[PDB]
């Protein structure tokens, strides 16, 4: 039980534009307290868990800083940090980051990792921005993530936290094998992923299949734990995919959400279970041959 | 249109006692059954011309009796003549013994032949599994590193069968780099024959066999044909579960036995274009400036 962490996937429900930020934080604290009642030491929150999924609406490139966060924590997010530190629970929180760097105002899709002591240990900014940069009228639903966010400047990092090696990814990062492998080359043992995946009105069994296939594969082919937490439900007429999951280093699903609202899935994850395949099957130092992978970093498209 | 009917020619156990004449006749039998079913391409397993001889211990000078002198040779010529006759291309895995740059070299090799009978491509295995020395603690031995050296061809993609075709061998399919390197060459059909022993869980081994292929097919928007040589081979059970996977990651054909069996699927190569235009558009979304660890490191740091 030394390197055994009890993780709580805190899947969220829909957040409408009418919902105040205090109503959002109180739902997070409620999910946070449900994790403490079940003995969870880590609770994973979805992507942009402090606002509605606003990339679905059109505005100026600056005209949506109202959903961003002033600080981390700020006056609205401080009760969540004070609650987590009180119950001795660490958490990963996704939010839209508004920060002043080298004069200009920069915007990132950001997840922050907080230790059980309440100290910010790591910060990841989204790399693979989905959607399109400008308005497209023929599509039923819009997706303007590239319009409101710029590419993060942190890279896929792995920190020493919770008695092991923990990394973070955001949403459609989970669809790229490079996301898992880069952190896998840092001896990662637990990858935290929050995602907001829309669903086109009228299949869905294929969308849920692709959601778990990429995580179950990235977990097995890197012998690491993967926790995928979603913000689901019908959000102002836009349905968001659910299926929050916790995956073992064997690629097996040990916990899965059943609703599209505020739901908590928990699982006891032995970090020493990440050692089986690293010992032999997926021993990177032994079998891997980087001299044939040069196309991965040399080019971007096809040749 | 760009529709190719592929026939996954899964084989049964091939023991050391089996003559190569009986081995090729089993391959021709699978070839003829594929023609009667309209298959234009037949995928054969890894080392389909011999028993899985990394199972036994010997010096690196030995085991050459299982290798092939040329391609084709006197024993493999009937398979090529029947294939060109029926207008069928095929991918065959074998142990290659060749004289290159002076010294003789030994590779785990797969060759791709077009419906006209012309050798289109040749891939040599990169990720060699098993161990190099004898290990008495194992129930079964696995000495691929002892009898083969790392191939010097790399993951190639050719223009064949009206599309982009690549090849991989066995445990290459468990590495995400195998699919991605060919995916960066606009691959649309990956042919993988494998020999994977089964230790007496079994359900988890078959799960990992399909999970890696269903992911490599979806995450690169390509067809993946996985053929196996299954059955109990001299007291050593080999995994079956030969599958044909769509670019969506779905299994459209799957073998039901552990012997000589043929799975057939109509593979529209234009279905790869659905996801390469947006979802997996490499030119649009991939950020290679954050992937540098993939090529700079081998282990972990």
Coordinates of C-alpha atoms in Angstrom, one line a residue:
Chain A
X1 CA 0.0 0.0 0.0
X2 CA 3.1 2.2 -0.1
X3 CA 2.9 3.2 -3.7
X4 CA -0.9 2.6 -4.0
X5 CA -2.9 5.8 -4.8
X6 CA -6.7 6.0 -4.7
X7 CA -7.7 8.3 -7.6
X8 CA -11.2 9.8 -8.0
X9 CA -12.3 10.7 -11.5
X10 CA -14.7 13.7 -10.9
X11 CA -16.7 13.8 -14.1
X12 CA -18.7 17.0 -14.4
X13 CA -22.1 17.8 -15.9
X14 CA -23.1 20.6 -18.3
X15 CA -22.2 24.2 -17.4
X16 CA -24.5 26.7 -19.1
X17 CA -23.6 30.4 -19.8
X18 CA -26.1 31.4 -17.1
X19 CA -24.3 29.4 -14.4
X20 CA -22.3 31.6 -12.1
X21 CA -18.7 30.8 -11.2
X22 CA -19.7 30.2 -7.6
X23 CA -22.2 27.6 -8.7
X24 CA -19.4 26.0 -10.7
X25 CA -16.9 25.9 -7.8
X26 CA -19.5 24.6 -5.4
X27 CA -20.1 21.6 -7.7
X28 CA -16.4 21.0 -7.7
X29 CA -16.2 21.2 -3.9
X30 CA -19.1 18.8 -3.7
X31 CA -17.3 16.3 -6.0
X32 CA -14.2 17.0 -4.0
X33 CA -15.9 16.0 -0.7
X34 CA -17.4 12.9 -2.3
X35 CA -13.8 11.8 -3.0
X36 CA -12.8 12.3 0.6
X37 CA -15.7 10.3 1.9
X38 CA -14.4 7.4 -0.3
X39 CA -10.8 7.8 0.8
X40 CA -9.5 9.3 -2.5
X41 CA -6.1 11.0 -2.3
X42 CA -6.2 12.4 -5.9
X43 CA -9.2 13.8 -7.8
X44 CA -9.0 14.6 -11.5
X45 CA -11.2 17.4 -12.9
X46 CA -12.1 17.9 -16.6
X47 CA -10.7 20.4 -19.1
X48 CA -11.9 24.0 -18.6
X49 CA -13.8 22.9 -15.6
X50 CA -14.4 26.5 -14.4
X51 CA -16.6 27.7 -17.3
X52 CA -18.8 26.7 -20.2
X53 CA -17.1 25.2 -23.2
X54 CA -17.0 28.6 -24.9
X55 CA -14.9 27.7 -28.0
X56 CA -18.3 26.8 -29.5
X57 CA -19.3 30.5 -29.7
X58 CA -18.0 33.3 -31.9
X59 CA -16.4 36.5 -30.5
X60 CA -13.3 38.6 -30.9
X61 CA -9.9 37.1 -30.3
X62 CA -9.9 39.1 -27.0
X63 CA -13.7 39.1 -26.5
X64 CA -13.8 36.0 -24.2
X65 CA -11.3 36.8 -21.4
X66 CA -14.3 36.9 -19.0
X67 CA -14.2 33.1 -18.9
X68 CA -10.5 33.0 -18.2
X69 CA -9.0 33.0 -14.7
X70 CA -7.5 36.1 -13.1
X71 CA -5.0 34.1 -10.9
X72 CA -4.5 30.5 -9.7
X73 CA -6.0 30.5 -7.2
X74 CA -8.1 33.6 -7.2
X75 CA -11.0 34.8 -5.1
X76 CA -13.5 32.3 -6.7
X77 CA -11.1 29.3 -6.8
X78 CA -9.6 29.8 -3.3
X79 CA -12.4 27.9 -1.5
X80 CA -11.5 24.8 -3.7
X81 CA -7.8 25.1 -2.8
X82 CA -8.6 25.6 0.9
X83 CA -11.0 22.6 0.9
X84 CA -8.5 20.3 -0.8
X85 CA -5.7 21.2 1.5
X86 CA -8.0 20.7 4.5
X87 CA -9.0 17.2 3.5
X88 CA -5.4 16.5 2.4
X89 CA -6.4 15.8 -1.2
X90 CA -4.5 16.7 -4.3
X91 CA -6.2 17.5 -7.6
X92 CA -5.7 18.4 -11.2
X93 CA -7.8 21.3 -12.4
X94 CA -8.3 22.4 -16.0
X95 CA -9.0 26.0 -16.8
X96 CA -8.5 28.8 -19.3
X97 CA -5.3 30.7 -18.3
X98 CA -5.0 34.4 -18.8
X99 CA -1.4 35.5 -18.0
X100 CA 0.9 38.4 -18.7
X101 CA 4.2 37.3 -20.2
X102 CA 6.7 39.6 -22.0
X103 CA 4.2 42.4 -22.1
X104 CA 1.6 40.7 -24.3
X105 CA -1.4 38.9 -22.9
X106 CA -1.2 35.2 -23.5
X107 CA -4.1 32.6 -23.4
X108 CA -3.6 28.9 -22.7
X109 CA -5.7 25.9 -22.2
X110 CA -4.1 24.8 -18.9
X111 CA -4.3 22.1 -16.3
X112 CA -2.6 22.6 -12.9
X113 CA -1.5 19.7 -10.6
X114 CA -1.9 20.4 -6.9
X115 CA -0.3 18.1 -4.2
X116 CA -2.2 16.9 -1.1
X117 CA -0.4 19.7 0.8
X118 CA -2.0 22.3 -1.4
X119 CA 1.1 23.3 -3.3
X120 CA 1.1 23.7 -7.1
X121 CA 3.6 21.1 -8.3
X122 CA 3.1 21.2 -12.1
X123 CA 1.4 23.0 -14.9
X124 CA 0.7 21.8 -18.4
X125 CA -0.5 24.0 -21.3
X126 CA -2.4 22.4 -24.2
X127 CA -0.3 21.6 -27.3
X128 CA -2.7 20.1 -29.9
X129 CA -5.3 22.8 -30.3
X130 CA -8.4 21.3 -32.1
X131 CA -11.1 22.9 -34.2
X132 CA -10.7 25.8 -36.6
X133 CA -9.3 29.4 -36.2
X134 CA -12.2 31.3 -37.8
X135 CA -15.9 31.0 -38.3
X136 CA -17.3 28.4 -40.8
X137 CA -21.0 28.8 -41.6
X138 CA -21.7 25.4 -43.2
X139 CA -21.0 23.4 -40.0
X140 CA -23.8 22.8 -37.6
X141 CA -21.5 23.4 -34.6
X142 CA -18.4 25.6 -34.3
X143 CA -15.1 24.8 -32.6
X144 CA -12.9 27.9 -32.2
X145 CA -10.2 26.7 -29.8
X146 CA -7.4 27.9 -32.0
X147 CA -9.0 31.3 -32.0
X148 CA -9.0 31.9 -28.3
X149 CA -5.9 29.9 -27.3
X150 CA -2.3 29.7 -28.5
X151 CA 0.0 26.7 -28.4
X152 CA 1.3 26.0 -24.9
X153 CA 5.0 26.5 -24.1
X154 CA 5.4 23.9 -21.4
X155 CA 5.6 20.6 -23.4
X156 CA 4.6 17.2 -22.0
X157 CA 6.2 17.2 -18.6
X158 CA 6.3 14.5 -15.9
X159 CA 6.7 15.5 -12.2
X160 CA 7.5 13.7 -9.0
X161 CA 4.2 13.7 -7.2
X162 CA 1.9 11.4 -5.2
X163 CA 4.8 8.9 -4.7
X164 CA 5.4 8.4 -8.4
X165 CA 5.7 10.0 -11.8
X166 CA 2.7 12.0 -12.9
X167 CA 2.0 13.6 -16.2
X168 CA -0.9 15.7 -17.7
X169 CA -2.6 16.0 -21.0
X170 CA -5.6 17.9 -22.3
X171 CA -8.5 16.6 -24.4
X172 CA -7.5 15.7 -28.0
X173 CA -3.9 15.3 -26.9
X174 CA -5.1 11.7 -26.0
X175 CA -5.7 11.0 -29.7
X176 CA -2.0 11.4 -30.5
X177 CA 0.5 8.5 -29.8
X178 CA 3.2 11.2 -29.3
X179 CA 1.4 12.5 -26.2
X180 CA 1.8 9.2 -24.3
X181 CA 5.2 8.3 -25.7
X182 CA 6.9 11.6 -24.8
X183 CA 5.8 11.2 -21.2
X184 CA 6.5 7.5 -21.3
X185 CA 10.1 8.4 -22.1
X186 CA 10.1 10.2 -18.8
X187 CA 9.1 7.0 -16.9
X188 CA 5.6 8.3 -16.3
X189 CA 3.3 6.2 -14.1
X190 CA 0.0 8.2 -14.1
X191 CA -1.4 10.4 -16.9
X192 CA -4.2 12.8 -16.0
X193 CA -6.4 13.8 -18.9
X194 CA -9.5 16.1 -18.8
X195 CA -11.4 16.4 -22.1
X196 CA -14.4 18.2 -23.6
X197 CA -15.4 16.1 -26.7
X198 CA -18.6 17.3 -28.5
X199 CA -21.0 15.0 -30.1
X200 CA -22.7 15.7 -33.5
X201 CA -26.5 15.5 -33.3
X202 CA -27.6 12.3 -35.1
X203 CA -22.5 7.3 -34.6
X204 CA -22.2 7.6 -30.8
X205 CA -21.0 4.1 -30.2
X206 CA -18.0 4.8 -32.5
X207 CA -17.2 8.1 -30.8
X208 CA -17.1 6.4 -27.4
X209 CA -15.1 3.5 -28.9
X210 CA -12.4 5.9 -30.2
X211 CA -12.4 7.8 -26.9
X212 CA -11.4 4.6 -24.9
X213 CA -9.3 3.0 -27.7
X214 CA -6.8 5.8 -27.6
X215 CA -6.5 5.8 -23.8
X216 CA -6.4 2.0 -23.4
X217 CA -3.7 1.8 -26.0
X218 CA -1.6 4.7 -24.7
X219 CA -1.8 3.2 -21.2
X220 CA -0.8 -0.3 -22.3
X221 CA 1.8 0.7 -24.9
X222 CA 3.5 2.9 -22.3
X223 CA 2.7 0.8 -19.2
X224 CA 1.1 3.6 -17.2
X225 CA -2.1 4.6 -15.5
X226 CA -4.5 6.9 -17.5
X227 CA -7.4 8.8 -15.9
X228 CA -9.8 10.4 -18.4
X229 CA -12.3 12.8 -16.9
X230 CA -15.0 14.5 -19.0
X231 CA -17.4 17.4 -18.8
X232 CA -20.6 15.8 -20.3
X233 CA -24.2 16.5 -20.7
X234 CA -26.3 18.8 -23.0
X235 CA -24.6 22.2 -22.7
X236 CA -26.9 24.9 -24.2
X237 CA -28.0 22.5 -26.9
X238 CA -24.5 21.0 -27.5
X239 CA -24.1 17.5 -26.2
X240 CA -20.7 16.6 -24.7
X241 CA -19.3 13.1 -24.6
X242 CA -19.1 11.4 -21.2
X243 CA -17.5 8.0 -20.5
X244 CA -15.0 9.1 -17.9
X245 CA -12.6 6.3 -17.4
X246 CA -9.6 5.0 -15.4
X247 CA -7.3 2.7 -17.3
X248 CA -4.6 0.3 -15.9
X249 CA -1.1 -0.1 -17.3
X250 CA -2.5 -3.3 -18.9
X251 CA -4.9 -1.2 -20.9
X252 CA -7.9 -2.5 -19.0
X253 CA -10.7 -0.3 -17.7
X254 CA -11.0 -0.5 -14.0
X255 CA -13.6 2.4 -13.5
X256 CA -16.1 3.9 -15.9
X257 CA -18.8 6.6 -15.5
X258 CA -22.4 5.8 -16.2
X259 CA -24.0 9.3 -16.4
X260 CA -23.5 12.5 -18.2
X261 CA -23.6 14.7 -15.1
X262 CA -21.6 15.3 -11.9
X263 CA -20.3 11.8 -11.2
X264 CA -17.3 10.4 -9.4
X265 CA -15.5 7.2 -10.3
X266 CA -12.8 5.9 -8.0
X267 CA -10.1 3.2 -8.3
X268 CA -7.2 2.0 -6.3
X269 CA -4.2 2.3 -8.6
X270 CA -1.0 0.5 -7.6
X271 CA 1.8 2.5 -9.2
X272 CA 4.0 -0.6 -8.9
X273 CA 1.8 -2.2 -11.5
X274 CA 3.5 0.1 -14.1
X275 CA 6.6 -2.1 -13.7
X276 CA 5.5 -5.3 -15.4
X277 CA 5.8 -4.2 -19.0
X278 CA 8.6 -1.7 -18.3
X279 CA 10.6 -4.7 -17.0
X280 CA 10.5 -6.7 -20.2
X281 CA 7.8 -6.2 -22.9
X282 CA 8.0 -2.4 -23.1
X283 CA 11.6 -2.0 -21.9
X284 CA 12.4 1.2 -23.9
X285 CA 16.2 0.9 -23.2
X286 CA 16.3 -2.6 -24.7
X287 CA 14.0 -3.0 -27.7
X288 CA 13.5 0.6 -28.9
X289 CA 15.3 1.7 -32.0
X290 CA 15.3 5.5 -32.4
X291 CA 17.4 5.5 -35.6
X292 CA 14.3 4.4 -37.6
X293 CA 11.8 6.9 -36.0
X294 CA 13.5 10.0 -37.5
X295 CA 10.4 10.9 -39.6
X296 CA 8.4 11.6 -36.4
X297 CA 10.5 14.7 -35.5
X298 CA 11.8 15.6 -38.9
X299 CA 8.6 16.3 -40.8
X300 CA 5.0 17.4 -40.0
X301 CA 2.9 16.2 -43.0
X302 CA 3.5 13.3 -45.4
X303 CA 6.3 12.4 -47.8
Chain B
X1 CA -13.1 3.2 -56.6
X2 CA -9.9 1.8 -55.0
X3 CA -11.4 -1.4 -53.5
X4 CA -9.1 -4.3 -52.8
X5 CA -10.5 -7.6 -51.4
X6 CA -7.8 -8.9 -49.0
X7 CA -7.5 -12.5 -47.8
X8 CA -5.8 -13.0 -44.4
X9 CA -4.2 -16.4 -44.8
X10 CA -3.7 -17.6 -41.2
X11 CA -1.7 -20.8 -41.0
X12 CA -1.6 -23.7 -38.5
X13 CA 1.3 -25.2 -36.7
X14 CA 4.4 -26.0 -38.7
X15 CA 6.7 -28.5 -37.0
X16 CA 10.3 -29.3 -37.6
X17 CA 9.3 -32.6 -39.1
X18 CA 7.2 -30.9 -41.8
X19 CA 8.8 -30.9 -45.2
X20 CA 9.0 -27.6 -47.1
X21 CA 7.1 -29.3 -49.9
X22 CA 4.2 -29.8 -47.6
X23 CA 4.6 -26.2 -46.3
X24 CA 4.3 -24.6 -49.7
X25 CA 1.4 -26.8 -50.7
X26 CA -0.5 -25.5 -47.7
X27 CA 0.3 -21.9 -48.9
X28 CA -0.9 -22.7 -52.4
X29 CA -4.1 -24.2 -50.9
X30 CA -4.7 -20.9 -49.1
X31 CA -3.9 -19.0 -52.3
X32 CA -6.4 -21.0 -54.4
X33 CA -9.1 -20.6 -51.8
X34 CA -8.5 -16.8 -51.9
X35 CA -8.9 -16.7 -55.7
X36 CA -12.2 -18.5 -55.5
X37 CA -13.4 -15.9 -52.9
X38 CA -12.2 -13.0 -55.1
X39 CA -9.2 -12.0 -53.1
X40 CA -6.7 -9.8 -54.9
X41 CA -4.1 -9.8 -52.1
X42 CA -3.1 -12.6 -49.7
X43 CA -1.3 -11.9 -46.4
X44 CA 0.9 -14.7 -45.0
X45 CA 2.3 -14.9 -41.5
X46 CA 5.9 -14.2 -40.3
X47 CA 8.4 -16.9 -41.1
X48 CA 5.7 -18.8 -43.1
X49 CA 8.3 -21.1 -44.7
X50 CA 9.6 -22.9 -41.6
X51 CA 8.9 -23.7 -38.0
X52 CA 9.4 -20.9 -35.5
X53 CA 13.0 -22.0 -34.9
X54 CA 13.9 -19.2 -32.4
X55 CA 12.2 -21.7 -30.1
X56 CA 15.4 -23.9 -29.9
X57 CA 19.0 -23.3 -28.7
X58 CA 21.9 -23.5 -31.1
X59 CA 24.9 -21.4 -32.3
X60 CA 24.3 -18.4 -34.6
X61 CA 26.1 -20.4 -37.4
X62 CA 23.3 -23.0 -37.3
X63 CA 19.6 -22.6 -38.1
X64 CA 20.5 -21.8 -41.7
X65 CA 18.6 -24.9 -42.8
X66 CA 15.4 -22.9 -42.1
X67 CA 16.6 -19.8 -44.0
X68 CA 16.0 -19.1 -47.7
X69 CA 18.9 -18.9 -50.2
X70 CA 17.1 -16.7 -52.7
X71 CA 13.6 -15.3 -53.2
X72 CA 12.2 -17.1 -54.9
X73 CA 14.1 -20.4 -54.9
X74 CA 13.3 -23.9 -56.1
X75 CA 10.9 -24.7 -53.3
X76 CA 9.2 -21.3 -53.4
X77 CA 8.9 -21.0 -57.2
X78 CA 5.6 -22.9 -57.3
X79 CA 3.9 -20.4 -55.0
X80 CA 5.0 -17.5 -57.2
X81 CA 3.9 -19.2 -60.4
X82 CA 0.5 -20.0 -59.0
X83 CA 0.0 -16.4 -57.7
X84 CA 0.9 -14.8 -61.0
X85 CA -1.3 -17.3 -62.8
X86 CA -4.5 -16.4 -60.8
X87 CA -3.5 -12.7 -60.8
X88 CA -3.1 -12.4 -57.1
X89 CA -0.4 -10.5 -55.1
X90 CA 0.8 -11.7 -51.7
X91 CA 3.1 -10.8 -48.8
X92 CA 5.3 -13.7 -47.5
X93 CA 7.4 -13.7 -44.4
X94 CA 10.6 -15.8 -44.3
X95 CA 14.1 -16.0 -42.9
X96 CA 16.5 -14.3 -45.3
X97 CA 20.0 -15.5 -45.9
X98 CA 21.8 -13.0 -48.2
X99 CA 25.4 -12.0 -49.0
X100 CA 25.6 -8.2 -48.7
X101 CA 28.7 -6.0 -48.3
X102 CA 30.9 -9.0 -48.1
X103 CA 29.8 -10.9 -45.0
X104 CA 26.6 -13.0 -45.0
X105 CA 23.6 -11.5 -43.2
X106 CA 20.5 -13.0 -41.7
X107 CA 17.2 -11.0 -41.6
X108 CA 13.6 -11.7 -40.6
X109 CA 12.1 -10.5 -43.9
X110 CA 8.7 -10.0 -45.6
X111 CA 8.4 -9.5 -49.4
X112 CA 5.5 -7.9 -51.2
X113 CA 4.5 -9.3 -54.7
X114 CA 2.1 -7.6 -57.1
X115 CA -0.6 -9.4 -59.0
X116 CA 1.7 -9.5 -62.0
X117 CA 4.3 -11.4 -60.1
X118 CA 6.8 -8.6 -59.6
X119 CA 8.6 -8.1 -56.2
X120 CA 7.4 -4.6 -55.1
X121 CA 9.0 -4.3 -51.7
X122 CA 11.0 -6.0 -49.0
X123 CA 11.0 -5.2 -45.3
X124 CA 13.4 -6.5 -42.7
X125 CA 12.4 -6.8 -39.1
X126 CA 13.5 -4.0 -36.8
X127 CA 12.3 -4.7 -33.3
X128 CA 13.8 -8.2 -32.5
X129 CA 12.0 -9.8 -29.5
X130 CA 13.2 -12.5 -27.1
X131 CA 16.7 -12.9 -25.6
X132 CA 20.2 -13.5 -27.0
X133 CA 21.4 -16.2 -24.6
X134 CA 19.8 -19.3 -23.3
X135 CA 17.6 -18.9 -20.2
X136 CA 16.8 -22.1 -18.3
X137 CA 14.2 -20.5 -16.1
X138 CA 11.9 -19.9 -19.0
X139 CA 9.3 -22.6 -19.9
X140 CA 9.9 -21.9 -23.6
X141 CA 12.9 -20.2 -25.2
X142 CA 12.7 -17.2 -27.6
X143 CA 16.1 -16.4 -29.2
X144 CA 15.3 -14.1 -32.2
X145 CA 18.1 -11.8 -31.2
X146 CA 20.5 -14.8 -31.6
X147 CA 19.6 -15.9 -35.1
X148 CA 18.7 -12.5 -36.7
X149 CA 20.2 -9.1 -36.8
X150 CA 18.4 -5.8 -37.0
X151 CA 17.1 -5.1 -40.5
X152 CA 18.6 -2.3 -42.6
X153 CA 15.5 -1.3 -44.7
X154 CA 13.3 0.6 -42.2
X155 CA 9.6 1.1 -42.4
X156 CA 8.9 1.6 -46.1
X157 CA 5.7 2.4 -47.9
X158 CA 5.3 1.5 -51.6
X159 CA 2.8 2.2 -54.4
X160 CA 1.1 -1.1 -54.9
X161 CA -2.5 -2.4 -55.4
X162 CA -3.7 1.1 -56.3
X163 CA -2.7 2.6 -53.0
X164 CA 0.0 3.0 -50.3
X165 CA 1.1 -0.3 -48.7
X166 CA 3.5 -0.9 -45.9
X167 CA 4.7 -3.9 -44.0
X168 CA 5.7 -4.8 -40.4
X169 CA 6.7 -8.0 -38.7
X170 CA 5.3 -9.4 -35.4
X171 CA 6.2 -7.5 -32.3
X172 CA 6.6 -4.3 -34.4
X173 CA 2.9 -4.0 -34.0
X174 CA 3.1 -3.2 -30.3
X175 CA 5.2 -0.1 -30.9
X176 CA 3.4 3.1 -31.8
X177 CA 6.4 4.3 -33.8
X178 CA 5.8 1.4 -36.3
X179 CA 2.4 2.8 -37.4
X180 CA 3.3 6.4 -37.1
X181 CA 6.5 6.3 -39.3
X182 CA 4.5 4.7 -42.1
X183 CA 1.5 7.0 -41.4
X184 CA 3.9 9.9 -42.1
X185 CA 4.3 8.3 -45.5
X186 CA 0.5 8.4 -46.2
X187 CA 0.2 4.7 -45.7
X188 CA -3.2 3.1 -46.4
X189 CA -2.6 -0.6 -45.8
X190 CA -0.2 -2.2 -43.3
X191 CA 0.5 -6.0 -43.6
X192 CA 1.7 -7.7 -40.4
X193 CA 2.4 -11.4 -39.9
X194 CA 3.3 -12.5 -36.4
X195 CA 4.3 -15.5 -34.4
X196 CA 3.5 -14.9 -30.7
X197 CA 3.8 -17.8 -28.2
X198 CA 1.1 -18.2 -25.5
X199 CA 2.2 -19.0 -22.0
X200 CA -0.3 -21.2 -20.1
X201 CA -3.9 -15.1 -19.0
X202 CA -4.8 -16.1 -22.6
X203 CA -7.7 -13.6 -22.8
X204 CA -5.3 -10.7 -22.0
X205 CA -2.8 -11.7 -24.6
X206 CA -5.4 -11.7 -27.4
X207 CA -6.7 -8.4 -26.0
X208 CA -3.2 -6.8 -26.3
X209 CA -2.8 -8.3 -29.8
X210 CA -5.9 -6.5 -31.1
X211 CA -5.6 -3.3 -29.0
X212 CA -2.3 -2.4 -30.6
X213 CA -3.6 -3.0 -34.1
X214 CA -7.0 -1.4 -33.7
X215 CA -5.2 1.7 -32.3
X216 CA -2.5 1.9 -35.0
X217 CA -5.2 1.6 -37.6
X218 CA -7.4 4.3 -36.2
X219 CA -4.7 6.7 -35.0
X220 CA -3.1 6.6 -38.5
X221 CA -6.3 6.2 -40.6
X222 CA -5.1 3.0 -42.3
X223 CA -6.0 -0.6 -42.9
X224 CA -4.2 -3.2 -40.8
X225 CA -4.1 -6.9 -41.7
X226 CA -2.8 -9.1 -39.0
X227 CA -2.2 -12.8 -39.9
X228 CA -0.9 -15.4 -37.5
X229 CA 0.7 -18.9 -37.5
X230 CA -1.2 -20.5 -34.7
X231 CA -1.7 -24.0 -33.2
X232 CA 0.4 -26.2 -30.9
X233 CA 3.9 -26.2 -32.5
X234 CA 6.0 -29.0 -31.0
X235 CA 4.3 -28.5 -27.6
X236 CA 4.4 -24.7 -27.9
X237 CA 1.0 -23.0 -28.5
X238 CA 1.0 -20.0 -30.8
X239 CA -1.5 -17.2 -30.7
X240 CA -4.2 -17.0 -33.3
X241 CA -6.8 -14.2 -33.7
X242 CA -5.9 -13.1 -37.2
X243 CA -7.8 -9.9 -37.9
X244 CA -8.4 -7.3 -40.6
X245 CA -8.9 -3.8 -39.2
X246 CA -10.5 -0.8 -40.8
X247 CA -9.1 2.8 -40.6
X248 CA -11.8 3.3 -37.9
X249 CA -10.1 0.7 -35.7
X250 CA -13.0 -1.7 -36.2
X251 CA -12.4 -5.4 -36.8
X252 CA -14.2 -6.4 -40.0
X253 CA -12.8 -10.0 -40.2
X254 CA -11.4 -12.3 -37.5
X255 CA -10.2 -15.9 -37.5
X256 CA -12.1 -18.5 -35.5
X257 CA -9.5 -21.3 -35.5
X258 CA -5.9 -21.9 -34.7
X259 CA -5.1 -23.6 -38.0
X260 CA -5.0 -23.0 -41.8
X261 CA -7.8 -20.4 -42.1
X262 CA -8.7 -17.6 -44.5
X263 CA -10.4 -14.3 -43.5
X264 CA -11.7 -12.0 -46.2
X265 CA -12.7 -8.4 -46.2
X266 CA -13.5 -5.8 -48.9
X267 CA -11.2 -2.9 -48.0
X268 CA -12.0 0.5 -49.6
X269 CA -8.8 2.5 -49.5
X270 CA -10.7 5.7 -49.9
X271 CA -12.1 5.3 -46.4
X272 CA -8.7 6.4 -45.2
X273 CA -9.4 9.8 -46.6
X274 CA -12.2 10.4 -44.2
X275 CA -9.9 11.0 -41.2
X276 CA -6.8 12.2 -43.0
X277 CA -8.6 15.4 -44.1
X278 CA -9.4 16.7 -40.6
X279 CA -9.2 14.4 -37.5
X280 CA -5.7 13.0 -38.3
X281 CA -4.5 15.7 -40.6
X282 CA -0.8 15.4 -39.8
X283 CA 0.2 18.7 -41.6
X284 CA -2.4 20.7 -39.6
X285 CA -2.2 19.4 -36.0
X286 CA 1.1 17.7 -35.4
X287 CA 3.6 19.7 -33.4
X288 CA 7.0 18.0 -34.0
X289 CA 8.8 20.5 -31.8
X290 CA 7.4 18.7 -28.7
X291 CA 8.2 15.2 -29.9
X292 CA 12.0 15.4 -29.7
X293 CA 12.3 12.8 -27.0
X294 CA 11.0 10.2 -29.4
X295 CA 14.2 10.4 -31.6
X296 CA 16.7 11.7 -29.0
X297 CA 16.3 9.0 -26.4
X298 CA 16.1 5.2 -26.3
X299 CA 15.2 4.6 -22.6
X300 CA 13.8 6.9 -19.9
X301 CA 15.1 10.1 -18.3

